[PDB]
Amino acid sequence: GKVIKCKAAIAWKTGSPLCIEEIEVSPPKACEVRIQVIATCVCHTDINATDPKKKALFPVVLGHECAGIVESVGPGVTNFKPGDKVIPFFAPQCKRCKLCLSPLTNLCGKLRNFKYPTIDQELMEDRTSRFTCKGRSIYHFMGVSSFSQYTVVSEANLARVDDEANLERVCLIGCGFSSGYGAAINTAKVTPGSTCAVFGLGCVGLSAIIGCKIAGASRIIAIDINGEKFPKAKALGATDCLNPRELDKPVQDVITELTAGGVDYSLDCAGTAQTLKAAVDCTVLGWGSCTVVGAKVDEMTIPTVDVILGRSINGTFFGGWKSVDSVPNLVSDYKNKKFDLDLLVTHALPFESINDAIDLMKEGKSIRTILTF
Amino acid sequence: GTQGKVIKCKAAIAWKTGSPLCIEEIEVSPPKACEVRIQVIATCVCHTDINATDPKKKALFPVVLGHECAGIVESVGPGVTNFKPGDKVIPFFAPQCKRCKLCLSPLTNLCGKLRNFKYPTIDQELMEDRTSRFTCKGRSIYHFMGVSSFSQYTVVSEANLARVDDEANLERVCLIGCGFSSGYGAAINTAKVTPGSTCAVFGLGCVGLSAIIGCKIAGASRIIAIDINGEKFPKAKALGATDCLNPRELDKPVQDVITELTAGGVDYSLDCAGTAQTLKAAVDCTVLGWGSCTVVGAKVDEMTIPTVDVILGRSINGTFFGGWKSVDSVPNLVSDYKNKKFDLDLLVTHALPFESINDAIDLMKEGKSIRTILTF
Ligand SMILES: NC(=O)c1ccc[n+]([C@@H]2O[C@H](COP(=O)([O-])OP(=O)(O)OC[C@H]3O[C@@H](n4cnc5c(N)ncnc54)[C@H](O)[C@@H]3O)[C@@H](O)[C@H]2O)c1
Ligand SMILES: NC(=O)c1ccc[n+]([C@@H]2O[C@H](COP(=O)([O-])OP(=O)(O)OC[C@H]3O[C@@H](n4cnc5c(N)ncnc54)[C@H](O)[C@@H]3O)[C@@H](O)[C@H]2O)c1
Ligand SMILES: [Zn+2]
Ligand SMILES: [Zn+2]
Ligand SMILES: [Zn+2]
Ligand SMILES: [Zn+2]
């Protein structure tokens, strides 16, 4: 149980980017595992914390998508040992609450702020922190904090995985891939031979397409305002591609015409007012289904008639997966080549170059950027 | 009443919005191909009808309103064999052609007969050949929702009616024409209330109460009834409500009352009022993870749903005629009523002569009635 000194990325406040600092990562207490981050990625959620218009706590060690090894475990911990390949996640499964036992949801009672899940799991189970830098205790982020060479997480926020897993790719299963993928399969519940529509072709949206294909969809329409996204969209299974920017008609009307009624399943992995409205509009009447995955705005307005006429609306949380039991399976699949994560990794960079990773992200020049140490 | 001949009878015409209904003598043309002329025996005023007289609402005039009724076939048109003079029938706004994609899908109860998907209320304003069967004072009167039951005799499409048990009490079974079927089906079909679950219903009118009946039948273990009219609580409870709430007498939003009361929220919520308040509340009051909200009523065009709610498990949908496959379901509902599966009798508060329709409308407006049977 020795204290560890390593580099991590600290956000001391909004507006101000992340700083590479030297922090002290305390050892894991009971029911906790101290992880060694091998590969982490910057996700849209990470960058929001620094946005003033968005709620967040500081100072904080951001990041939540990664994969690694077990550095050391805490007391009573027997499910983990030094060397085990593990993947942490923001979606807990403590297996000690009513929600964990329910087959109707993948939510867990460990959670507490159901209005701002982004500022939850800001501290360990004992309301304490394991991060210290220059005499100050730093907040954890969404129960993961992957932007540090070493981090400590609740046994409820990680799963051991295949020993032969390539941490440089399997890490996406920590958030990006799992949400898009699971959103199509568990939340939207895409059915064989169906027609789907996916707005937003980032990591989530692409995994949603991968998800639609795996579920057996016969048609998959990918929509983005960034044409540069299309090539890879098709690579993963898209049958059609639309750019609102190049259409003299609201993209939803185009989709409705191209399908003679609209699509059976809609998945919004963008989250804008425009996309949210379209995601619903483009669905057929009677059984049309829209599933919210991404959300850049807090509210969505829905016509009372649309709903009276068959269209339903739901949303996903971590792809609807029961984290601790599913993550390991998703890994086995990638291994068995059920799908290919590599197409999702467009860049790789030294951890210290995390800000440039953020810049490529914002610039929309990438899907996911693997950060190594 | 003789076939192939125009009929002179009385109806209730709405010459324009903001105006009451006028008892006029109209001419009801005989049925054309795939049509049936019905002698309306019993009819009721639904909120949807009154809604048409609202100046702020998009509607067409002149028109014979009414869509909730029951009656006897006075005659059929060319090439009609499923119906014949004497048959008891119940028409409805929800068509079932049986010969279209939508009709074949077990996922919806809509048929491709419907044309206007943004303003249903002003759809089926005329017959298939784009004309009218109604003439009054040298003028063409608009039909309403493919029924127009506010006339002793009316002409409807074969896809808009079902033949029911010859021994059906048409002065009760007429509620299956809309009100009952809607709330009842909403809980059973659209919301899909399951055994042991907890439900919340907003709006304790005919629909709202039928929604309660349906929750009881589906096996709910708790049915919370919400309404700003405490007078509606006795019947609501009589039909199955285990708890009753009035937002006008609470310090906290009703949805927070319901959340606490249920330690998390209800499994299924049905909004049979349809206001900006009820809609928001209907979604809020549900449990996260698997909470389900079903829109039944709607006095407003839109509802604002928080992104996080949906992400965190709550989902939304709505019903159209309770989600019953019209022609196939309606006769079944009648049999169920005969087998005393439920009591429509409790949904009837008044019974006036057709001439008093304007009073029946006021009673509804003034929330002093559930349903008022109108007879000719
Ligand atoms: N519900 C969950 O559990 C969950 C899990 C992970 C990520 N997310 C969220 O999902 C979203 C997507 O994640 P990402 O990593 O792919 O982000 P990203 O920024 O890379 O993806 C957004 C994509 O949508 C496109 N876009 C923007 N406006 C558009 C418009 N009007 N029409 C069409 N396309 C448009 C962009 O060009 C881009 O390709 C984020 O908002 C993220 O926070 C949600
Ligand atoms: N979706 C469909 O297919 C369908 C079919 C038929 C009728 N409807 C609609 O369903 C609704 C109900 O029909 P009805 O015949 O029972 O109408 P109604 O006028 O008799 O019922 C209104 C009821 O809601 C209550 N109410 C009003 N504001 C409220 C509030 N803020 N909170 C709680 N309760 C409130 C009233 O006090 C009253 O008891 C109407 O809007 C009607 O047009 C929909
Ligand atoms: Zn993420
Ligand atoms: Zn749990
Ligand atoms: Zn009605
Ligand atoms: Zn049909």
Curated annotation (Swiss-Prot), chain A:
One of its GO terms (biological process) is fatty acid omega-oxidation. Keywords: Cytoplasm, Lipid metabolism, Metal-binding, NAD, Oxidoreductase, Zinc. It is found in: Cytoplasm. One of its GO terms (molecular function) is zinc ion binding. The keyword Metal-binding applies. Oxidation of 20-HETE is inhibited by low concentrations of N-heptylformamide. Oxidation of 20-HETE is a decreased by 55-65% by either all-trans-retinol or all-trans-retinoic acid. Strongly inhibited by omega-hydroxy fatty acids. InterPro entries: ADH-like_C, ADH-like_N, ADH_Zn_CS, GroES-like_sf, NAD(P)-bd_dom_sf. It catalyses: all-trans-retinol + NAD(+) = all-trans-retinal + NADH + H(+); 9-cis-retinol + NAD(+) = 9-cis-retinal + NADH + H(+); 20-hydroxy-(5Z,8Z,11Z,14Z)-eicosatetraenoate + NAD(+) = 20-oxo-(5Z,8Z,11Z,14Z)-eicosatetraenoate + NADH + H(+); 20-oxo-(5Z,8Z,11Z,14Z)-eicosatetraenoate + NAD(+) + H2O = (5Z,8Z,11Z,14Z)-eicosatetraenedioate + NADH + 2 H(+). One of its GO terms (cellular component) is cytosol. CDD domains: alcohol_DH_class_I_II_IV (cd08299). SUPFAM superfamilies: GroES-like, NAD(P)-binding Rossmann-fold domains. Liver specific. Zn(2+) 2 binds at C94, C97, C100, C108. NAD(+) binds at residues 45, 200-205, 224, 229, 293-295, 316-318, 368. Binds 2 Zn(2+) ions per subunit. Its EC number is 1.1.1.105. The keyword Metal-binding applies. Its cofactor is Zn(2+). Zn(2+) 1 binds at C43, H64, C175. Catalyzes the NAD-dependent oxidation of either all-trans-retinol or 9-cis-retinol. Also oxidizes long chain omega-hydroxy fatty acids, such as 20-HETE, producing both the intermediate aldehyde, 20-oxoarachidonate and the end product, a dicarboxylic acid, (5Z,8Z,11Z,14Z)-eicosatetraenedioate. Also catalyzes the reduction of benzoquinones. Belongs to the zinc-containing alcohol dehydrogenase family. Class-II subfamily. Dimer. This is All-trans-retinol dehydrogenase [NAD(+)] ADH4. It comes from Mus musculus (Mouse). The gene is Adh4.
From Swiss-Prot, chain B:
Its cofactor is Zn(2+). Binds 2 Zn(2+) ions per subunit. InterPro entries: ADH-like_C, ADH-like_N, ADH_Zn_CS, GroES-like_sf, NAD(P)-bd_dom_sf. Zn(2+) 2 binds at C97, C100, C103, C111. One of its GO terms (cellular component) is cytosol. The keyword Mitochondrion does not apply. Its EC number is 1.1.1.105. It catalyses: all-trans-retinol + NAD(+) = all-trans-retinal + NADH + H(+); 9-cis-retinol + NAD(+) = 9-cis-retinal + NADH + H(+); 20-hydroxy-(5Z,8Z,11Z,14Z)-eicosatetraenoate + NAD(+) = 20-oxo-(5Z,8Z,11Z,14Z)-eicosatetraenoate + NADH + H(+); 20-oxo-(5Z,8Z,11Z,14Z)-eicosatetraenoate + NAD(+) + H2O = (5Z,8Z,11Z,14Z)-eicosatetraenedioate + NADH + 2 H(+). One of its GO terms (molecular function) is NADPH:quinone reductase activity. It is an enzyme of class 1 (oxidoreductase). GO terms for biological process: alcohol catabolic process; aldehyde metabolic process; ethanol metabolic process; fatty acid omega-oxidation; quinone metabolic process; retinol metabolic process. NAD(+) binds at residues 48, 203-208, 227, 232, 296-298, 319-321, 371. It is found in: Cytoplasm. Zn(2+) 1 binds at C46, H67, C178. Keywords: Cytoplasm, Lipid metabolism, Metal-binding, NAD, Oxidoreductase, Zinc. Changing S182T: Strongly increases activity towards ethanol, increases KM for benzoquinone 10-fold. It holds the Pfam family ADH_N. Liver specific. Dimer. Belongs to the zinc-containing alcohol dehydrogenase family. Class-II subfamily. Catalyzes the NAD-dependent oxidation of either all-trans-retinol or 9-cis-retinol. Also oxidizes long chain omega-hydroxy fatty acids, such as 20-HETE, producing both the intermediate aldehyde, 20-oxoarachidonate and the end product, a dicarboxylic acid, (5Z,8Z,11Z,14Z)-eicosatetraenedioate. Also catalyzes the reduction of benzoquinones. This is All-trans-retinol dehydrogenase [NAD(+)] ADH4. The lineage of its organism: Eukaryota, Metazoa, Chordata, Craniata, Vertebrata.
